[PDB]
């Protein structure tokens, strides 16, 4: 319960980033892991100082008067630990890895801190062979996401001296799985006003927590996984997607948590897989992460010589929903070059 205020801030960051993405790619699939993005950037901030550090955590939604820097750091450590704590029937792992250039001068304190407190695996990497370094990192992320996130990094700058990656993998079974014998092989899904695509449409009638939001004109359906997780489906009325998107916030989630009521639903859900990628460099800059990218970047907590700056950031995430449950994964990439 001590983590709720932090997860609430992390959720509002999720919704604000989501809204940036709807501007970048309007009327298109969006899919990402906000916790992966938040966790990777907080970890980077652990080695930052002064405005370089404060910009990162403020961009993540934190208010330093409400929650001091050290409290944010300790809170995220507790969050990651709790997410990774084994729960029968749930596969959920969030981890990170640091690939350190052969000539980098990382502080021993920093490395021991992240290995012990942040789950981090640290690898010595020869970036002078940029093609092999990229393959090494991509294969590591692929392995850690159970094969689901392939080719996270498309290009790696030739002068790279450090890479930070975060990965998340989630696999869970529905509390009430669908019977594939009741799945319609080919059913219509409306992708715009006049256009359908065909998808298998799963079908069951069971009790679920659900509501119709009278203010936002959307249906909200909660589908439980068998252990410690749930999915929320938000289905706007015709023409209401934009207004629902505008309204999504932790405040809205809290309202819905009170209003959801469990009762019978005749439920049709599509079986499908999607993937999405994001080049986050300029987005994170616009959102307020400025000094990290500059020749005056302050990462004095990270290397002896304060020798690096952020150069690029990217995210990839994948989703599958089917009769048994859901499998999803994501990964965050942060690239550093000499300052």
Curated annotation (Swiss-Prot):
One of its GO terms (molecular function) is serine-type endopeptidase inhibitor activity. Thyroxine binds at residue 257. The keyword Glycoprotein applies. GO terms for biological process: thyroid hormone transport. GO terms for cellular component: extracellular exosome; extracellular region; extracellular space. Glycans are attached at residues 63, 80, 129, 217. It is found in: Secreted. Keywords: Glycoprotein, Secreted, Signal. Expressed by the liver and secreted in plasma. Changing residue 97 to P: Montreal/TBG-M; partial thyroxine-binding globulin deficiency. The keyword Protein transport does not apply. Changing residue 211 to P: CD5; complete thyroxine-binding globulin deficiency. Major thyroid hormone transport protein in serum. Belongs to the serpin family. This is Thyroxine-binding globulin. It comes from Homo sapiens (Human). The chain holds residues 37 to 364 of 415 of the full protein.
